[PDB]
Amino acid sequence: MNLNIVPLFEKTLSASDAGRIGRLVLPKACAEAYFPPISQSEGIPLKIQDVRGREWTFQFRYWPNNNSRMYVLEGVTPCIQSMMLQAGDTVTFSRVDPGGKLIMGSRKAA
DNA sequence: AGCCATGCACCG
DNA sequence: CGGTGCATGGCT
Structure with missing residues (x-):
């Protein structure tokens, strides 16, 4: 099966x-549908490539x-300013299938 | 009912 | 006393 980017969800x-x-x-709903199930409040490291x-x-x-x-990603500040994002901008989380490799990107508000 | 944006106590 | 870890309250 050829590689395919499949969009998962976004966050404004x-x-x-x-x-x-x-x-x-x-x-x-999105964190529980698409990210790895976590049982412990401490969570897991998550690698996401752009x-x-x-x-x-x-x-x-x-x-x-x-x-x-509530589900969260900690440590996002280097990512957010490397992408010049601000409040109202959108981050998109997607996956490359087969494989399930997590990827991400973003866009500025209209 | 309960998500989720943000307030805020307290631990170090 | 700044940040972590959770509480509170606007909102649907």
């Missing part, structure tokens, strides 16, 4: 996602939130 950056804290909140070949390492983890969870 909030002020919190794009600012000094360096944590991006992932939509819960079209310019840069491989970014995030920590994919969650926060307990009432009896539920």
Whole structure:
């Protein structure tokens, strides 16, 4: 089977996602559908490569939130400013199949 | 019902 | 006392 880019989901950056804290909140449904299942709040390192070949390492983890969870990527600040993104800009998460290799890209708000 | 943007306590 | 880890509240 030939390689194919398959889009997974996107996140429109909030002020919190794009600012000094360096944590991006992932939509819960998307994180649970498409990223690796994680059982422990601490999470796992997650490697995601962009079209310019840069491989970014995030920590994919969650926060307990009432009896539920919020999922986040920690360590996103180098990625966000290397791409000149701000609040309102969009990050796209995709996969290369077969393989399931995670990739990403972004676009500026209209 | 409960996501998710952001507030905020407290631990080191 | 700055950041981590979670709480709180706007919103649908």
